[PDB]
């Protein structure tokens, strides 16, 4: 009833949803890594 | 029929081989040269992996028939955790015994005499029950695996204190988790009692025979009960690897070669885990026979014959609230035939030591109806317990 705190931290969830391993398991995920490497991002993924 | 496998759950079959392998006289091009997967190249076929030097942990399990003791004949093994459906009937059939209700007259007349009672027998046992179920643990409600061995050991100490009045109980000593094996042939099928026991009591001198010769002769005409739909083997473990050698728990020259009492404990929190009272009495019948059979063959020989000097082995089963008592005498070794002399076994079933115990005081309508302590007490159950312990002396 008081929104604003939708982010409840969790390392297990964060590394399973946005982790480096998951990014390389789907063909669409690899394209996300390729786009961020081309743009020059400091951190490709979590 | 309806096979219990499921296609999805079962391991998938290997993928079909590439068409190149089907062409005679054509070497396929595989990616095994670059030792990594590459699309467009045929999948290699490798010979089974052959480690030059065998490694203990990481090698495949050897086949069962590779064991030197593997034998074609199927031997049936009865360990501690084997359940028998017709517990009293199957144990009687496999052992060739005759069930006699009530403890023997030597045992029963050994406890009714007031000259064989510990000081404050009623009070001390009442303290033993309370100590076992409520006092021995910091928790309010001790679990069964804690108070099942405590109550048995506490009662052993009570009857151990009688050594001062009878200075012959010092000939006894206890043994733990010994390996026992006894194999015998019973009507063209091979049975073997193998495993361990909870607690074992051994004495230097053998236990005297308890059955009169009139009862032994009356045992010849007794006919073993039979059950057609259920085979006597049901409930045992069929083992193709075994050794035909009656091995007791002790080597030669043991100063306590005569077992006296076996203590079987059914300690488990869950109801389905524990043996039923009918099945528990079956467990005592076979193990008490296995110990008796080991002596009957070690002291006389492997030849099968009727024993002129019987061997008596006792055993007590405990649930924590309900007790089982068994006295078994062994008279026959040649168990192949069913027409000779049978054995004898006296069993007291469901000797209730106490009805119920209240760890916390029950409160109904703001008043106390039943205080803390056991409800109902039958001293005769402990009195029979004391009788078996003093049977040798």
């Amino acid at each position: 009833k008081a929104r604003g705190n939708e982010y409840q931290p969790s390392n297990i969830k964060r590394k399973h949803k946005h982790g480096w391993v998951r990014r390389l398991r789907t063909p669409t995920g690899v394209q996300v890594i390729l786009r961020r490497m081309h743009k020059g991002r400091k951190s490709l993924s979590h | 029929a309806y096979e219990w496998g499921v296609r999805s759950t079962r391991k998938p079959e290997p993928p079909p081989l590439d068409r190149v392998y089907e062409i005679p006289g054509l070497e396929p091009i595989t990616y095994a040269g670059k030792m990594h997967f590459m699309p467009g190249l045929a999948r290699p076929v490798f010979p089974p992996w052959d480690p030059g030097w065998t490694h203990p942990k990481f090698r495949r399990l050897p086949p069962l028939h590779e064991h030197p003791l593997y034998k074609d004949q199927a031997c049936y093994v009865f360990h501690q955790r084997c359940r028998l459906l017709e517990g009293v009937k199957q144990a009687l059939w496999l052992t060739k015994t005759q069930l006699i209700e009530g403890l023997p007259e030597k045992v029963l007349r050994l406890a009714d005499d007031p000259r064989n009672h510990i000081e404050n027998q009623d009070e001390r046992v009442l303290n033993a029950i309370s100590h076992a179920r409520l006092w021995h643990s910091t928790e309010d409600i001790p679990k069964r695996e804690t108070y099942c061995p405590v109550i048995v050991d506490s009662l052993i100490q009570l009857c151990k204190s009688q050594i001062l009045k009878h200075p012959s109980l010092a000939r006894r000593i206890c043994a733990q988790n010994n390996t026992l094996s006894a194999t015998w042939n019973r009507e063209s099928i091979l049975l073997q009692v193998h495993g361990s026991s909870g607690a074992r009591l051994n004495a230097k001198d053998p236990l005297p025979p308890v059955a009169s010769q009139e009862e032994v002769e009356a045992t010849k005409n007794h006919v073993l009960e039979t059950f057609y739909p259920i085979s006597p083997t049901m409930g045992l473990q069929e083992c193709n690897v075994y050794d035909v050698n009656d091995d007791t728990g002790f080597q030669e020259g043991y100063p306590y070669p005569c077992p006296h009492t076996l203590y079987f404990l059914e300690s488990a929190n869950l109801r389905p885990r524990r043996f039923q009272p009918d099945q528990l009495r079956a467990k005592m019948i076979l193990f008490a026979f296995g110990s008796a059979l080991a002596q009957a063959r070690l002291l006389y020989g492997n030849d099968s014959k009727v024993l002129e000097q019987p061997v008596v082995v006792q055993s007590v089963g405990t649930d924590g609230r309900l007790f089982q008592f068994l006295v078994l005498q062994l008279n026959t070794t040649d168990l192949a035939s069913d027409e000779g002399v049978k054995n004898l076994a006296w069993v007291d079933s469901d000797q209730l030591l106490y009805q119920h115990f209240w760890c916390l005081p029950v409160i109904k309508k703001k008043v106390v109806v039943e205080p803390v302590g056991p409800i109902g007490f039958q001293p005769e159950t402990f009195r029979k317990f004391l009788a078996l312990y003093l049977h040798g002396a």
């Binding site: - | 219990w4 759950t9 079962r10 057609y228 085979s231 049901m234």
Partner: protein, 240 residues
């Protein structure tokens, strides 16, 4: 993400096996059947449908077994009974008045004259009398019992012509089957399962049924009392 079905056990065992609910979700993860989920946890008993199954192939003759106990099975609407014979035990569906300490005969020998129909015996449809109530119907020889297993459901044999039996299913539909198929005589246990009354909405949730959706759908042309002639007899006999 693809899930794995809990039906992974390969060896038959009388003891209850662990069970995982689905909730109407297929292997993909989407709802396919609505109104299922949130039930009480249950264990599954391995039920042996094939009544005639010898312990060994050395002696293919008829065998007789003994009933130990009759229990309640959460999965099916009937009551199952533990049956032991030889060196194995089996969970089979108990008939109307099967009790403990009873003997059940399983046989397949098709005799010319007849065989007396008992309340628990399983005999091929070729040896049963014409007016016999049957359940656990085997559609094809060796396939196993598939039909008539619910509580209180019993089919009645009609006639045997040119070495082929015709039975009446509980849906009042005639079915043709080879006379060598094994069937069980009697009515399935728990006769008053139909007369059971659910006292509250919560008891439906305990069984595992979720409430229906609240969308108001106007009735179409499918509704209304439809009177339709009985469909023709279903025959599993392959005519050469």
């Amino acid at each position: 993400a693809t899930s794995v079905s809990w039906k992974s056990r390969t060896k038959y065992t009388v003891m209850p096996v662990k069970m995982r609910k689905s909730g109407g979700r297929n292997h993909t993860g989407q709802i396919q059947v609505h109104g299922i989920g949130g039930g009480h946890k249950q264990r599954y008993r391995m039920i042996d449908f094939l009544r005639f199954r010898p312990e060994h192939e050395s002696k293919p003759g008829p065998f007789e077994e003994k009933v130990i106990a009759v229990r309640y099975d959460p999965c099916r609407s009937a009551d199952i009974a533990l049956v032991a014979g030889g060196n194995r035990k089996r969970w089979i569906i108990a008939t109307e008045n099967m009790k403990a300490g009873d003997t059940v005969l399983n046989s397949d020998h098709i005799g010319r004259m007849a065989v007396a129909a008992r309340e628990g015996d399983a005999h091929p449809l070729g040896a049963l009398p014409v007016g016999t109530l049957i359940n656990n119907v085997e559609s094809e020889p060796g396939r196993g019992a598939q039909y008539i297993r619910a509580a209180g459901t019993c089919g009645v044999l009609l006639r045997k012509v040119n070495g082929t039996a015709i039975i009446q299913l509980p849906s009042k539909r005639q079915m043709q089957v080879l006379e060598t198929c094994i069937a069980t005589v009697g009515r399935v246990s728990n006769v008053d399962h139909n007369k059971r009354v659910i006292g509250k909405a919560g008891r439906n949730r305990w069984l595992g049924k979720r409430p229906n959706s609240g969308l108001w759908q106007r009735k179409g042309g499918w509704a209304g009392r439809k009177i339709r002639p009985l469909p023709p007899m279903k025959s599993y006999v392959k005519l050469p």
